[PDB]
Amino acid sequence: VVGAKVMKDRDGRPAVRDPTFLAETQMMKKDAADRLMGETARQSGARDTTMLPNPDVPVTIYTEAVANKTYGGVFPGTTTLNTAAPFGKSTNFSKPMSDYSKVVVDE
Amino acid sequence: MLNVTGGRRPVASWRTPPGFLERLADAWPAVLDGAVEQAGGDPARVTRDSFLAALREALPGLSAAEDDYARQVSLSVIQQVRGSNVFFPDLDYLQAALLQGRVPPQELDQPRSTLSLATFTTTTRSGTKSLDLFKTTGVTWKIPKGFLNRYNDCNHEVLRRAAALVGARHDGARDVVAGVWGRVDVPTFVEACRQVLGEISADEEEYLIALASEQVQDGTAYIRDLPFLDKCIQNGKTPTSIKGPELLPSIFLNDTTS
Amino acid sequence: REVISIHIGQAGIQVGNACWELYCLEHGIQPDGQMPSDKTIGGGDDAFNTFFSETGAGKHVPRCIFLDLEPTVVDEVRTGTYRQLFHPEQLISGKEDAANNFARGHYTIGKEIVDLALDRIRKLADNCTGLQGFLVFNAVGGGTGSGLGSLLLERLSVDYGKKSKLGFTVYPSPQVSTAVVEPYNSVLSTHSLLEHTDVAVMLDNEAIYDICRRSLDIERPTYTNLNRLIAQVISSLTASLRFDGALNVDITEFQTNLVPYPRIHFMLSSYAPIISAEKAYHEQLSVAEITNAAFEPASMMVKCDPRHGKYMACCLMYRGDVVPKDVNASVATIKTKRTIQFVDWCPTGFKCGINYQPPTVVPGGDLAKVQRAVCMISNSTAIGEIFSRLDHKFDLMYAKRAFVHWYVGEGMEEGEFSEAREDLAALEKDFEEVGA
Amino acid sequence: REVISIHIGQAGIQVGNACWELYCLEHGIQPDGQMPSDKTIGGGDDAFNTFFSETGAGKHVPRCIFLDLEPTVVDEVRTGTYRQLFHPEQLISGKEDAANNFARGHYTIGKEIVDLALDRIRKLADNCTGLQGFLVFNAVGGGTGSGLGSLLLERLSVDYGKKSKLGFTVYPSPQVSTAVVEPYNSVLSTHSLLEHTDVAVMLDNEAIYDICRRSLDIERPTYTNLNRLIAQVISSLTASLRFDGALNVDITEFQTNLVPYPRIHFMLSSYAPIISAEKAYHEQLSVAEITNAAFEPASMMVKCDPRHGKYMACCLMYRGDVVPKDVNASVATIKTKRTIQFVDWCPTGFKCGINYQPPTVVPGGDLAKVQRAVCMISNSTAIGEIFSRLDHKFDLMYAKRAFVHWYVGEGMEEGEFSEAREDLAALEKDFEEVGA
Amino acid sequence: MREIVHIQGGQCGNQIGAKFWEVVSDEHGIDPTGTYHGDSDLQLERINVYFNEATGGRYVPRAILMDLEPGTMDSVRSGPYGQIFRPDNFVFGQTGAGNNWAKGHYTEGAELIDSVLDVVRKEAESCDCLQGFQVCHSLGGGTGSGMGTLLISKIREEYPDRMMLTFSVVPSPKVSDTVVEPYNATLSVHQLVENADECMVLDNEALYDICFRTLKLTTPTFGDLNHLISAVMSGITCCLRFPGQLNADLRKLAVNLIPFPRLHFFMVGFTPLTSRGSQQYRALTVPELTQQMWDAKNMMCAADPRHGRYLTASALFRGRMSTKEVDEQMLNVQNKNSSYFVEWIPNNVKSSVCDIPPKGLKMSATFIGNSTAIQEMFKRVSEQFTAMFRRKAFLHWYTGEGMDEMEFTEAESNMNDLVSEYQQYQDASA
Amino acid sequence: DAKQLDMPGRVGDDDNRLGPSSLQKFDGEDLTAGDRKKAQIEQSVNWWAEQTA
Ligand SMILES: Nc1nc2c(ncn2[C@@H]2O[C@H](COP(=O)(O)OP(=O)(O)OP(=O)(O)O)[C@@H](O)[C@H]2O)c(=O)[nH]1
Ligand SMILES: Nc1nc2c(ncn2[C@@H]2O[C@H](COP(=O)(O)OP(=O)(O)OP(=O)(O)O)[C@@H](O)[C@H]2O)c(=O)[nH]1
Ligand SMILES: Nc1nc2c(ncn2[C@@H]2O[C@H](COP(=O)(O)OP(=O)(O)O)[C@@H](O)[C@H]2O)c(=O)[nH]1
Ligand SMILES: [Mg+2]
Ligand SMILES: [Mg+2]
User: At the top level of its lineage, which domain of life is listed (chain B) (predicted)?
Assistant: First the structure.
């Protein structure tokens, strides 16, 4: 039996832990708290993330944004048709008029 | 190695001696026996020295250049793969390389792109992609005749319905930043367009399917940007950066107008 | 945003052969020249435009010129696996070596090779439209890298004048040294490396050796491992031009925020995490400790000790899983700690930068695939310690007129020696006086 | 909150390796690093954070640095079962020993290893954020345990100072002994152990041999069994940091409640019940008798009889099914009994601590699964007996200047011999005066 | 009727503007497609203040984006509510100032500002009755600070009557990005004290402090900092757009807060803002809004108000409230903390109420307090500026462009006498 | 009993009332970080097993 941090209170009563308050008052990080109490924190705050189709791409904050299609809105950037390399700079709108690759779909 | 994915690496392609291929064609079933019985009975344990000796005994033959060619080709083949470089990874790979005269054989090449009279088909990482000529280039599609008049009046209802189809609560604008508008499937988009514009001719509908199937992201099944798809369909133009090797000349040199 | 990269010397184009292999991998370009079959109809990124140019039918010919005098290493490039990647004209190559002889490379063979070199670069800049700057690659040990290197930088500065020329140079290490006349070459080169380079970045070899010995635990490292991680540093400070980030810095920012006086441009680079695949398995990667790891002298790219010096300014390129939240927290802890100290005249001595794309691995490389990384480019007075360390062993050999007959025979005189020596003396006085 | 433990010497890392086996078993850590959630019935929590750090990818590395000069025993750790648990980078191993020599271990070799050690510990302390304190494990008999063990403690007091440095040392036994130069080693170590250790706890080996002979009745023990029950002591005095109980006592209280003067920190220790698997079933374990049994000299961890001394203060850690009522009753009847006596000027000579979690067993160890246990840490004048007995046989050997040429050849002189002798003399005057 | 032309300068300007136009678009119920979708009619009558009806229910914002780097514009156009701006209003250069105020004020500004002036003038006379211009920019970068500052001076010379708000973030040493932050902030502030009508000093230091202590978020990206500043801007102009029992336009607030023409630097806050763990335990009353509004750890500047005196203060409330409760709370706050308020101005608190809350909230508030604790910020910047300028560090990057030494001397002297006039008004009596 | 008849400002995570204009729901606070870290761990384990092999 692994020992918990705060097992029982002064009375003989088991302790149900509040992970949200911990995540608020930074007594532990939220990324750690959810994994450590995956049962309550999923009921308390947490839900699963959307994954990219290709697992070779690293999974980071911006990759999760571009996965669940909130990339351009939440994060200042440009959405890309490709998904293997999402953060490729695309400047179709800002390209000068006489550029050799410039379409006028937006204008 | 032959079962590897096969990449576009440039080749060396020594010129082969003339009477060599027709003699290897009937000699190699014996050279495979010789190399194996010299290597101890199992494949993938043949040294290039043992292979050269088995070749020299199986084909007595072997004028100077005809032997030097085999020796040089075997040397290149053994260095192809990073590692120990003490044995041969694949005897069939070596045989094919010796027949073709190319360090990397014809069998390890790419799949290519089929170009029937109108269409252009590319087998890609995720499925196949197709482009139909006589009605498009890479950048500009040929808009149907009576479509824009009917689309520009009921333009916005199309997306209102397209989001309602995928579950957008149109009262609050929270869902747009939530990202439900981001994910829209192609048949759902065309069904919303049908429900908005009524009867959609097969030609105009195919135009819509083509443009949406372009704008959809690779991998996932849903489009990237709906309000951008709006101006896309309106303008009849696409941000495709159509590439070079075999599609770019075939569009603009061939006569696809009539 | 577009930047062209010229390589001067046998060390320059071996670095370039590692850098361009990394760039083709970061943009998915197959070594024969063009993107795979997936991206033929719709394509994608459009990020490559700052290094490659989409030519003809499915080809991306990079924006660089390898130039050397012996045809050995250049023809090795011409016959390697990147036969198709580089346009034949760009890979310049002379006929005979400068042979560790600054005078030979600056007065004898330069006069016929540099005109062809800069008449190529001119048509590269004309194909360009929004040229950010040039970036040069040279080792000041040899003759080609130093001799016509100095001649090229001079004629580039007379043709363009104010354009930013990032100079990633390689000095001779103090103890690990491969030549004898390299002090003469280094001193005569630095008199023009001072005056024509906009921002110079020092890269000594024994520092990178200790990195591979200690961190990556490669017990027997060859030059390809060094050039690999040098390419990683170049990639990490240009990724802001290539991929979009939350807080971007271009080439113009380095000139702005790291050069407090036009004669002080010598940057001790660094990088973190330089971790093998097993130590990565044991050690966690968070922004706080890799920011700390980028500051210790056991992870810098130049064998010098900043504890003897005072930081003038600092630049920090972050890549990958990085939020401005914790990088502000980390630089906070750094500025409150006192184990390192800044110059009084700079009170806000940092400049951060964040990019989204994490660094890549190269198959055959030994670094592990990480989610985040940091590349520091600082400025201090440890550099002023380096020049005097080199100045002393130049004055040793020059006191007995050793090897002088070679240079005087090739076309120079001894006034160049005296003037290059007193220049280093003046630059030493400059560094001591700024650090006060 | 975090506490990181350093180990100095061949006994240091053997103790360290019994402790870390016990810790991994207590928090359910498989030796390859991760914990299987299925197998451990206990509820999950972040109690482990004070020893293990969540590193890499689902991995826990201890907050520890073994350091030794011989590569033998350290490389033996690197080949043992816990290969993947520790870093390869935290086990610091020299190339040549100190070889039973404070001099060789304090002047010659320490000056090379101490810089790498404490400039690694800075990176562990940087990873921590709520660092409680360091705790050192060492035997003063050897060379590296004494010499650079004192050099480490000295530079720790300079670098950090206010962070608590708990000391668990191993003094040579009076009659059972393994070395000859150990008096010189122990004396020259304890002069600095005075003014640099915060709280020191003595641990003698013949006392523990007595325990395993009498109580656990293992007639042929090894150092492992000694290491095992010493780890029981360490685990039971950090259990309040790890698992919260009814009345917790952290690492900052021993300093407060047991150190009445800044130059008086030497603590007898004990443990009860130390009971095999067959006396466990028969004997009914209750709080009263285990509080009694932890007070006789037949159950202490130091060969000394406090009946000749006066208890200056005491500290009682309890684990398991202990209510505050009966522990208060037991400490009451001890206070009333006159077989032991407390110093007059200290009326309230106790500090209790209570933790719910019972002490765990090591399958294959000799102890049985126990409901409740006591770990006492007291302070008395019997320690004044120990140092004086040791001082007698140091001057015995020093009278003929035996072995001195070893130290003088290493770089010492005779002054520190004299001042370390009279320093123990002053301390003896201190303990004899405080006991008044 | 009364109109607000929005101007966004630089990267920070554009990203704040993007979240701002998202917030306003949700308040008025217009979707990413630029058409109306809302339910209440009360949303339609006052979108002339921000939009222009184009064709069949198509409203394009009255904004002008201006910067010097393509990445910022694409971040604008690519996100949702990005395809609603008019491409003509995207005046835009592509060299890049790069943290160089001189570049943003003499080389690139001097030739790009005329095209910006075309777009802003064209959009200024696109409406009937200007209420004022609303410029949102930063003081750290160059393309925001330098070009924005020249834009301010040119606009104030063309249209001197209309109002002029400027939301400017100031570089703070605690979270200090670039190195030449003081060289840009000092010169920019000197121009702001002579051209802008009123300024609202933000800073990322207090914004981060809010998201940590009060909101208690875990990953406060720049999206939320823009979220906060945007909510402040919306709260400022709620009174123009919605009917209230006591209205307060921009010019009404300015005349109630600015006692002297040079003294127009405000500190701002917002209410309510509570963590999601603590939103279960709270109530929604006017006292519950005031206790968080006047809280020193809820200001959006890094100046503790109890280090000085509140010269004037203002509060804009939204929701079904009682004016007696509003005025009694302001009176109680003014009477308890009777030392932090200036003596020679009785009744230092202007107040106003509007009946339309934000979508989903029951009640909200917005605070604008013109204090004399703002000279803490300017002294904190000026000390770094004089630290470098005693030693001509980084000075060549400006001097080699057209700037001289006298510009720095006068900029420091203007900063010096401003904090001097704030000290004298703080130590004045009656 | 206005206080007693009134709903809390935010009820949980998914709430139809709470749009972007109302400041009760912030995107920057993410409840998915916990599982995102798990995904990171899986990626790293796979990558480094491959590299070691
Ligand atoms: N960092 C690094 N330095 C290299 C590498 N290869 C060669 N060098 C350096 O090159 C210096 C000598 O000059 P080289 O590049 O070999 O030859 P060169 O500069 O072209 O001069 P010449 O021999 O006259 O042609 C030595 O100091 C080496 O340190 C490399 O792969 N990496
Ligand atoms: N209590 C206890 N003491 C030990 C143990 N192992 C070694 N020792 C003691 O260690 C003391 C000598 O130091 P060592 O650890 O053997 O050697 P060292 O500390 O590395 O010093 P050098 O041999 O000079 O390098 C002796 O007095 C032993 O009694 C152990 O497992 N338990
Ligand atoms: N609140 C906020 N501040 C920002 C943002 N982007 C940058 N900053 C701050 O602005 C300063 C640099 O501004 P900068 O981007 O150079 O301004 P610009 O380039 O002229 O648009 C830094 O100190 C940042 O902290 C943002 O999106 N929001
Ligand atoms: Mg060379
Ligand atoms: Mg030993």
Answer: Eukaryota
Residue B113, beta-bridge partner list: B122
Nearest Cα neighbor of C195 from C109, C262, C126, C100 is C262
Cα distance between residue A57 and residue F43, in whole Å: 9
Six token digits for residue B72: 């040089």
Q: Strand D2-8 relative to strand D131-139: parallel, antiparallel, unpaired?
A: parallel
Q: Say if the Cβ atoms of E275 and A24 lie within 8 Å.
A: yes
Tokens 């345990």 locate to: D145
d(CA B244, CA B253) in angstroms, rounded, equals 13
User: Taking Cα atoms as reference points, which of E247, E243, E254, E234 lies closest to residue E364?
Assistant: E234
- Cis bond upstream, residue C221 (ω within 30): no
Task: Report chain D residues whose CB lies below 8 A from the CB of A28.
Answer: 46, 49
Question: Which 8-state DSSP code applies to residue B14?
Answer: P
Q: Which of C364, E368, E254, E63 is nearest to B81 (CA)?
A: C364
- Elucidated via: cryo-EM
Choose the mutation target among F14, F16, F23, F30 for the interface with B, i.e. most B CBs under 10 Å. F16
DSSP state of C270: B
Catalytic residue of the set D154, D206, D253, D385: D253
Cβ atoms of residues E9 and E155 within 8 Å: no
Q: What is the CA(C113)–ligand 4 centre distance, in A?
A: 15
* Three-state DSSP string of chain D: CEEEEEEECHHHHHHHHHHHHHHHHHCCCCCCCCCCCCCCCCCCCHHHHHCEEEECCCEEEECEEEEECCHHHHHHHHHCCCCCCCCCCCCEECCCCCCCCHHHHHHHCHHHHHHHHHHHHHHHHHHCCCEEEEEEEEECCCCCCCHHHHHHHHHHHHHCCCCEEEEEEECCCCCCCCCCCHHHHHHHHHHHHHHHCCEEECCCHHHHHHHHHHCCCCCCCCHHHHHHHHHHHHHHHHHHHHCCCCECCCCCHHHHHHCCECCECCECEEEECCCCCCHHHHCCCCHHHHHHHCCCHHHECCCCCHHHCCECECCEEEEECCCHHHHHHHHHHHHHCCCCCECCCCCCCCCEEEECCCCCCCCCCCCCCCCEEEEEECECCHHHHHHHHHHHHHHHHHCCCCCHHHHHHHCCCCHHHHHHHHHHHHHHHHHHHHCC
User: Taking CA atoms, what residue in F is nearest to E364?
Assistant: F22
Test mutation, F6, F10, F15, F22, chain E, max E CBs within 10 A = F22
DSSP class of residue E126? T
Helical (H) or strand (E) element with E60: strand E59-61
Measured in degrees and rounded to the nearest 5, phi and psi for residue D160 equal -115, -55
The two tokens of residue C93 are 């190559």
Question: Torsion over CA of E273, E279, E283 and E285, rounded to 10 degrees?
Answer: 20
Distances (CA, A) of C26 to C357, D48, E209: 10, 40, 38
Structure tokens at E258: 């600015």
* CB burial string E407-422: b at 16+ within 10 A, e below: bbeebbebbeebbeeb
Residue C143 and residue C102: Cα distance in Å, rounded?
5
Q: Which two tokens stand for residue D147?
A: 């010499």
- Identity of the amino acid at C339: T
**Distance between CA atoms of F9 and D310, rounded to whole angstroms?**
66
CA dist A14 and A6 (Å) reads 9
What's the CA-to-centroid distance between E180 and ligand 3, angstroms?
A: 13
Q: Specify the 3-state DSSP secondary structure of C93.
A: coil
- Say which DSSP state F3 is in: T
Residues in E touching A106 (Cβ below 8 Å): 77, 83, 87
Contacts of F31 (CB under 8 A, 6+ apart): A45, A46, A47, F13
Distance, CA of E157 to CA of E196 (rounded, Å): 11
Closest ligand relative to C256 C-alpha: 3
